[PDB]
Scaffold this motif. Structure first.
Motif, PDB file in Angstrom:
ATOM      1  N   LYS G  22       6.035   5.939  -1.288  1.00 15.05           N
ATOM      2  CA  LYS G  22       4.851   6.333  -2.262  1.00 15.05           C
ATOM      3  C   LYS G  22       4.199   7.389  -1.504  1.00 15.05           C
ATOM      4  CE  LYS G  22       2.766   5.136  -6.148  1.00 15.05           C
ATOM      5  NZ  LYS G  22       1.646   6.014  -6.277  1.00 15.05           N
ATOM      6  N   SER G  24       0.971   8.749  -2.852  1.00 17.27           N
ATOM      7  CA  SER G  24      -0.274   8.675  -3.560  1.00 17.27           C
ATOM      8  C   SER G  24      -1.380   9.277  -2.743  1.00 17.27           C
ATOM      9  CB  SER G  24      -0.652   7.565  -4.192  1.00 17.27           C
ATOM     10  OG  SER G  24      -1.326   6.792  -3.177  1.00 17.27           O
ATOM     11  N   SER G  76       4.920   9.867  -8.447  1.00 13.73           N
ATOM     12  CA  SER G  76       4.676  10.381  -7.078  1.00 13.73           C
ATOM     13  C   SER G  76       5.441   9.297  -6.141  1.00 13.73           C
ATOM     14  CB  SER G  76       3.434  10.726  -6.893  1.00 13.73           C
ATOM     15  OG  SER G  76       3.128  11.530  -7.399  1.00 13.73           O
TER      16      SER G  76
END
Ligand SMILES: *[C@@H]1O[C@H](CO)[C@@H](O[C@@H]2O[C@H](CO)[C@@H](O[C@@H]3O[C@H](CO[C@H]4O[C@H](CO)[C@@H](O)[C@H](O)[C@@H]4O)[C@@H](O)[C@H](O[C@H]4O[C@H](CO)[C@@H](O)[C@H](O)[C@@H]4O)[C@@H]3O)[C@H](O)[C@H]2NC(C)=O)[C@H](O)[C@H]1NC(C)=O
Ligand SMILES: *[C@@H]1O[C@H](CO)[C@@H](O[C@@H]2O[C@H](CO)[C@@H](O[C@@H]3O[C@H](CO[C@H]4O[C@H](CO)[C@@H](O)[C@H](O)[C@@H]4O)[C@@H](O)[C@H](O)[C@@H]3O)[C@H](O)[C@H]2NC(C)=O)[C@H](O)[C@H]1NC(C)=O
Ligand SMILES: *[C@@H]1O[C@H](CO)[C@@H](O[C@@H]2O[C@H](CO)[C@@H](O)[C@H](O)[C@H]2NC(C)=O)[C@H](O)[C@H]1NC(C)=O
Ligand SMILES: *[C@@H]1O[C@H](CO)[C@@H](O[C@@H]2O[C@H](CO)[C@@H](O)[C@H](O)[C@H]2NC(C)=O)[C@H](O)[C@H]1NC(C)=O
Ligand SMILES: *[C@@H]1O[C@H](CO)[C@@H](O)[C@H](O)[C@H]1NC(C)=O
Ligand SMILES: *[C@@H]1O[C@H](CO)[C@@H](O)[C@H](O)[C@H]1NC(C)=O
Lengths: 21, 425, 213, 214, 426, 213, 214
Positions: G22, G24, G76
């Motif tokens: 991930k 982010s 994302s």
């Protein structure tokens, strides 16, 4: 002597344009 | 001090005459002989570095060999280069060493293009060459009185690197240079019935003395076709330029060597046809030193390289290598005896050239051109037994022809046929 | 032939330290290297031969290593008599020497004592005018001297001389001399030389007047 | 082992110079003998070597053509001759021994060196030096010697009575072909008139006896 | 980042079409265009290193070029190689780059031996090739209805790298592959004189359509000998393969050309003889961009290399280089647009092949074999004033023939002579 | 591809020292080099992103230089948090990682403590016996351990475990374990391990007997 | 800028494993994403990277056979899929970002790294550990754990009662396919029997709690 595939070090002059394909 | 010798030869493929599996025992025997002699570089040790001159396919290539030579020169900077043997592979290495001013030794590469010392300086050829074949042919023509015309034919194959082509160009060029006579040439396919038929149609109207370069099977087929094609031995003569003697054994002196027997039902016809054919091969040394060296070479090869060698003239290729190495060592000593270093390529090359040496192969002579003079043998068929035997030998140092045990050439009509028939072509 | 390079060009170390000098060859040499040490005014002396062997009569502190194209010379437990120039020489063929490598002691940075001298009257009568100003007791040797005649930049007509390093104070002495024709001397009045040094906080100007002298 | 040289001559450009080196304490014909020249600022340079037993000589590529080396075994001496001298031929020549000859060990180092021979090539003539005192208009005094040839020149203060604080700068080659240098001394300011100062110069080739008082 | 381009060309000799004195300004112009174009390599700079491919004698050799290439690869490790032009020098370099998996770009070396991609992989030729001449010959034979026989003659001269050998062999192989007709060939020496007599004696027994590869002086002498012997244009046709336009000065825009006059006292005989001779040359670009590029090239070369260039088809050789370079840059961008690196080689070469590009010369196309298709031109003499002019152009992208302003290819008798006479060669 | 080499493989230095690490490439790369530092149990952290820049958040004591085929990473003053594994990575082509370079502190030579443990009865009950002997608090890390039972040596049936250098005393632990079947236990009598260390003047034998244990 | 990973599963050879990364806190489609695997004792090993905006992908020659990496710009996230797992695929995987996509600066170093995930490939069952106490025959006191799977093992003994002067050896993979280690700390022989010693071994995957008296 137009048989081709003689590009491997063609600096040799030689003779014998009688490939006779 | 240490003397570094670089070798560029095929390390995996063992089908070439100059393969490492057949040269390595000779190199180590030469090193042992040098170490066991106090007059050959006393207090000095020789190391050997190896490189591969073959591609992933395992055959000679003109790209891998120069790269390997360049890498070896960069990594170790050797004082002398050994090999390669293939003409295409060794051709750029010669120019590279000439530019680097590093002496080069080669017992192969019999191509005529290496005879130009301006482009290929500092190169020594201690092995067989093709110009000596031309000299032998010219001597035979002078002895037999043939002075009008000759014909040359060679076969084309996609496997070999134009061996017959190179041999024929060298022979034709030397014949033109010496005898200044009219000589023709043709190239024919190795396996083509129509080509064979048209060649047999063309041959009778071009000449009478004919030289053929091809495989033994092709030569046998051509002679069998000529048997019923109308060609006879009273007008036509055929010469087979088998340098290594593939049709025969060559390794041993006393043996039948029947070339026309194959167990195919045409043995009688082949024997009848072969009465007008002769074979030119290399000369087999007879001194016991050569036999001892051969035995040692076989023993060492079997012990180390796990390779079983076979008797024949091919064994004469690595042995010369050995001898050549010895010669080089001697030259170095002379330099060290005249106020010089081990990096004097020109002085060493001049010293080796035009010199006489003694080795397992006998009395070798190097002329001013840097090429070793070679000997040849001419065979003939026995009139009674029908088995081929050696009848003529050629000495290139004195350029003389010697008979064997008072033997005479077998001619169907008693005398060699003339170059031009009375009626004409 | 074969070009040999020395690294570094120069270095400084104190007594009892360890130094290393590297020699590089353009081509490949197995073990054909010799090391020489030369003092000023004296013949060179061979320390290490064949790049690994120490000659008899040489202290064991010197050591040599390396092969091929890279070689290293290591000196441990430096002594006051070990400060000289070192050369690496190849012996494969046509031996060639290096450019040299100096090695001196390290000392605290000092400030030069600049003095000036007016030209002698009898020298002017001869037909030549020479003015000299000297630098004394400065470290290191790197310094800049510029000649100014009536606040004009002078170049191409001055010479400088530097003495060897001393032992007691281990300082340097430099003298700069400017040569001019007889007629050029009287057409100017103010002559000065400018000194720029790392030790000096600011450049120092030493000036004098022709009319005063 | 000992190596002895001889020669301090100055030769005009285009002439020939001969350097002789004599060996003692060892057999002459058992080792190589190398000739090495060293420029005043460039550094050491190798020229060639001779092999006595085999009568072989080696020369550098640049020096080949105008160098000749000979030796005499009876007196154990070696001679080197150089022709066509130039302005860049001014250097110091050394004869060195290194490498046994029995096994052709030419790569061994040079362990014995000579004292050296100084050869100067220039177009000039012997001339007497000129001494000019240098005084200020801690105090510094000195004497400047200029326009002398050839080297060397020895300078002393008060006939050797005063030696502390005396600095002699190296000679510099002027554009006219001559040499000049200056010797300075540092003295306390209070001694400006208490004691006298006198610098003595000596030029052996010109036989110059000058005692200049500051 | 930085992009390195390695050039292996003669840096001193200024007699070759691929000499550095004529290529360097083109490379500079290409680099300036790339820098001025934000589309091509945004944020990247292109460098250039040079190496000599000539020996001490000053001619290209097969020994110095591979050594220079190896030294450049070891010292800089470039991503692309430029040149050389000589076949004997370029072939080992091409093999070395193929082994190293480094792309090679060139406009010279038009020999047929480079036409195989198994050995000469990752090699692109942006200049003229001899196979396109064979295609043009086949198209002309198809148009003119000749399908029986042909005759080939080439001259041998010491000093050059067999200029009339590679061209003749490539065209001969292409004709055999495409037309499937019986074709003969022969070599002669232009220095000798009896060779010309033997040629004129043996030509009538070997064919009626003859191609000749020799110098313009040799061609004129042969034509005069043929006229004196008895050869006429009603039965024989002669073609001169002058790719660079040596017999006709420059081969530039329209202008009267009289190659049969040199003030030797026999101009009338040469003019009469040349009624049966045609010339095959290259096709010059027509767009004004080519003229502007020529002007800037000449100006920059004169100011930066002390070299004075002339007007001719030879100037078409360096320009292609320029165009080719541009194409390469575009390909690199495509790789950088597809998540790749500049050190792959295979992707860039594959993207370059079989693509249409626009340059100073015009709209060029690269086939799947990486050989640029080139246009050709055929020159014919005006029957009125006896001056050669362009009458036919061949486009290789579409393989078509087009006339110029409705010009008609006139013949001495009215229609092209038959390939084989009704009575035969006997 | 391109093979990358790091020198030295290991290096020991004290706090506040000057250290240099050399990275060599088999092929020439202009400036495509990155330097990473990694600590045990932590992800690597980037230090230099081109040949001679400095990433944000990195102390100024780190520097990088070099070109062609050789590059250098220099630390002027070592700190206790600067001891980690260093990697140099090339980015001109398909990226490759080097073998690494371990950095450790400098400490005096210390003697090991040899401890032996005879096999427990639980191992005999389970049908497989195991003996262990360990070196405690030794420096440097290099040492040799051999197993000897009734003056016989066995190979391939032993395992070695070594810990990491401690922050407090800078010591190491080196435990050797020999595992054997239940059957092989009773046909031998005395089991021992021999330890050879640089700090020890002579190798030390630690032995025990099956019967009395 | 945060990089979050999840996954520590162990499975038999021949299966497939997926890793989620991930990204982010920053523009996912504005930078490259590199996947790097590090062996437990060999070193770092680059595998491949992806380009989100242009849909580009690059992989190593020896890894492109059985790796497939995709991405999801909606959340994302990046996914790494590995198949045909063998015994040589036991290592630690990392995901990182580096190099802008507006300019093709693929040579930029990886700035922000991930926490890393551990993947183990073995054909064995989750069986509890075996604890053997150590007793003397200036001593050797401790506990030895043998034949446990999988990693890791909790604190050695006493649940942290004795922390000063403690040493723990890393696990060693034996031929049988299991793990074993030990931890020995020696106290003075005076207080051998005064203080009792007990070693606690805890195994989350097998839920095994062992308390063995030393
Ligand atoms: C820049 O580049 C040009 C083009 O390559 C060079 O010009 C060539 O230079 C070479 C080298 O000398 C020439 O090659 C030689 O040619 C001789 C014949 O030339 C004569 O005949 C031609 C017509 O055919 C005339 O134009 C010419 O002016 C001469 O009158 C050959 O006989 C030579 O062979 C001999 O030498 C070679 C070794 O070089 C041997 O191997 C042979 O066995 C033989 O002994 C040689 O081949 C070439 O002819 C020149 N071409 C032209 C068009 O002039 C420039 O020299 C070069 N300049 C610089 C500064 O780099
Ligand atoms: C082809 O013909 C060649 C010449 O016609 C043959 O060469 C001859 O070979 C024999 C050996 O069978 C040599 O004889 C030996 O020579 C060596 C060398 O002599 C050295 O010493 C003498 C002393 O004066 C000196 O002058 C020489 O230069 C040598 O340094 C001797 O040592 C032997 O004892 C023996 O005499 C001939 O010398 C040699 N001829 C020449 C001219 O050298 C060759 O053998 C023939 N080929 C075949 C296959 O027989
Ligand atoms: C060893 O070399 C020989 C050449 O003498 C190889 O034989 C040739 O192999 C090629 C393909 O590699 C074929 O096209 C030829 O027809 C073969 N020639 C003959 C005479 O057989 C042989 O393959 C090589 N072997 C290895 C293992 O590399
Ligand atoms: C040769 O023919 C090709 C194809 O017919 C021509 O290429 C065209 O060029 C125009 C002008 O740029 C383009 O608009 C067309 O799209 C091209 N055709 C194709 C199929 O792409 C080429 O221009 C012709 N050569 C000359 C000199 O006109
Ligand atoms: C020769 O090689 C050996 C190692 O094989 C080495 O020890 C020796 O120094 C070398 N000698 C020279 C002169 O290079
Ligand atoms: C590109 O070259 C310049 C010098 O022209 C250099 O400063 C820079 O570091 C180079 N960059 C790379 C990525 O090689």
């Amino acid at each position: 002597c137009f048989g081709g595939r003689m590009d491997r070090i063609g600096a040799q002059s030689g003779l014998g344009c009688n490939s006779f394909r | 001090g240490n003397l570094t010798v670089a070798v560029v030869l095929p390390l995996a493929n063992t089908s070439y005459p100059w393969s490492w599996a057949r040269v390595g025992p000779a190199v180590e025997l030469a090193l042992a002989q040098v170490k066991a002699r106090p007059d050959l570089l006393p207090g000095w040790t020789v190391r050997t570095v190896l490189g591969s001159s073959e591609n992933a396919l395992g055959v000679c290539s003109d790209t891998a060999a120069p790269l390997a030579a360049v890498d070896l020169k960069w990594e170790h900077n050797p004082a002398v280069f050994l090999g390669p043997g293939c003409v295409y592979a060794a051709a750029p290495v010669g120019r590279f060493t000439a530019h680097w001013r590093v002496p080069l030794l080669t017992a192969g590469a019999p191509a005529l293009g290496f005879g130009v010392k301006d482009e290929y300086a500092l190169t020594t050829r201690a092995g067989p060459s093709y110009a000596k074949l031309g000299d032998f042919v010219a001597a035979l023509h002078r002895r037999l009185g043939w002075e009008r015309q000759a014909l040359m034919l060679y076969a084309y194959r996609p496997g070999d690197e134009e061996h017959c082509f190179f041999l024929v160009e060298g022979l034709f060029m030397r014949v033109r240079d010496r005898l200044n006579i009219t000589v023709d040439h043709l190239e024919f396919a190795e396996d083509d019935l129509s080509h064979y038929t048209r060649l047999l149609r063309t041959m009778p109207r071009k000449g009478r003395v004919i030289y053929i370069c091809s495989s033994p099977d092709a030569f046998r087929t051509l002679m069998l076709l000529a048997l019923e094609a109308g060609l006879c031995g009273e007008d036509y003569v055929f010469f087979h330029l088998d340098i290594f003697g593939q049709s025969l054994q060559g390794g041993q002196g006393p043996a039948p060597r029947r070339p026309w027997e194959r167990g195919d039902g045409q043995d009688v016809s082949a024997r009848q046809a072969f009465q007008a054919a002769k074979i030119i091969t290399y000369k087999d040394p007879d001194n016991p030193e050569y036999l001892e060296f051969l035995k040692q070479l076989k023993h060492l090869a079997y012990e180390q390289f796990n390779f079983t060698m076979e008797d024949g003239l091919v064994n004469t290729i690595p042995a010369s290598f050995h001898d050549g190495l010895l010669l080089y060592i001697q030259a170095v000593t002379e330099t060290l005896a005249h106020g010089g270093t081990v990096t004097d390529g020109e002085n060493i090359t001049q010293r080796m050239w035009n010199r006489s040496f003694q080795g397992v192969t006998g009395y070798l002579k190097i002329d001013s051109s840097g090429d070793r003079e070679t000997d040849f043998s001419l065979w003939d068929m026995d009139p009674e037994n029908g088995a081929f035997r050696v009848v003529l030998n050629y000495n290139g140092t004195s350029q003389e022809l010697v008979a064997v045990s008072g033997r005479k050439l077998n001619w169907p009509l008693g005398y060699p046929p003339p170059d031009i028939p009375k009626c004409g072509f | 032939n074969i070009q040999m390079t020395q690294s570094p060009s120069s270095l400084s170390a104190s007594v009892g330290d360890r130094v290393t000098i590297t020699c590089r060859a353009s081509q490949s040499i197995d073990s054909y290297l010799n090391w020489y040490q030369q003092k000023p005014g004296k013949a060179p002396k061979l320390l290490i031969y064949v790049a690994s062997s120490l000659q008899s009569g040489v202290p064991s502190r010197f050591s040599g290593s390396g092969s091929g194209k890279d070689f290293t010379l290591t000196i441990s437990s430096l002594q006051p008599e070990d400060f000289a120039t070192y050369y690496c020489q190849q012996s494969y063929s046509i031996p060639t020497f290096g450019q040299g490598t100096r090695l001196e002691i390290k000392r605290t940075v000092a400030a030069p004592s600049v003095f000036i001298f007016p030209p002698s009257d009898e020298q002017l009568k001869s037909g030549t005018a020479s003015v000299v100003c000297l630098l004394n007791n400065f470290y290191p040797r790197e310094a800049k001297v510029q000649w100014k005649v009536d606040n004009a930049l002078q170049s191409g007509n001055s010479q400088e001389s530097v003495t060897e390093q001393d032992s007691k104070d281990s300082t340097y002495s430099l003298s700069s001399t400017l040569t001019l024709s007889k007629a050029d001397y009287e057409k100017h009045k103010v002559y000065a030389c400018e000194v720029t040094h790392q030790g000096l906080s600011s450049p120092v100007t030493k000036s004098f007047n022709r009319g005063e002298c | 082992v000992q190596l002895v040289q001889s020669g301090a001559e100055v030769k005009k450009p285009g002439a020939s110079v001969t350097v002789s080196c004599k060996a003692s304490g060892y057999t002459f014909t058992d080792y190589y003998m190398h000739w090495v020249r060293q420029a005043p600022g460039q550094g050491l340079e190798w020229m060639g070597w001779i092999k006595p037993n085999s009568g072989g000589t080696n020369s550098a590529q640049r020096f080949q053509g105008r160098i000749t080396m000979t030796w005499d075994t009876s007196i154990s001496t070696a001679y080197m001759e150089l022709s066509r001298l130039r302005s860049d031929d001014t250097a110091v020549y050394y004869c060195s021994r290194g490498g046994p000859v029995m096994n052709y060990y030419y790569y061994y180092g040079m362990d014995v060196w000579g004292q050296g021979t100084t050869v100067t090539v220039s177009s000039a003539s012997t001339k007497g030096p000129s001494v000019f005192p240098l005084a200020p208009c801690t105090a510094a005094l000195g004497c400047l010697v200029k326009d002398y040839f050839p080297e060397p020149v020895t300078v002393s203060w008060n006939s050797g009575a005063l030696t502390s604080g005396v600095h002699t700068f190296p000679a510099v080659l002027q554009s006219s072909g001559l040499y000049s240098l200056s010797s300075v001394v540092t003295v306390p300011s209070s001694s400006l008139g208490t004691k006298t100062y006198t610098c003595n110069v000596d030029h052996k080739p010109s036989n110059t006896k000058v005692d200049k008082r500051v």
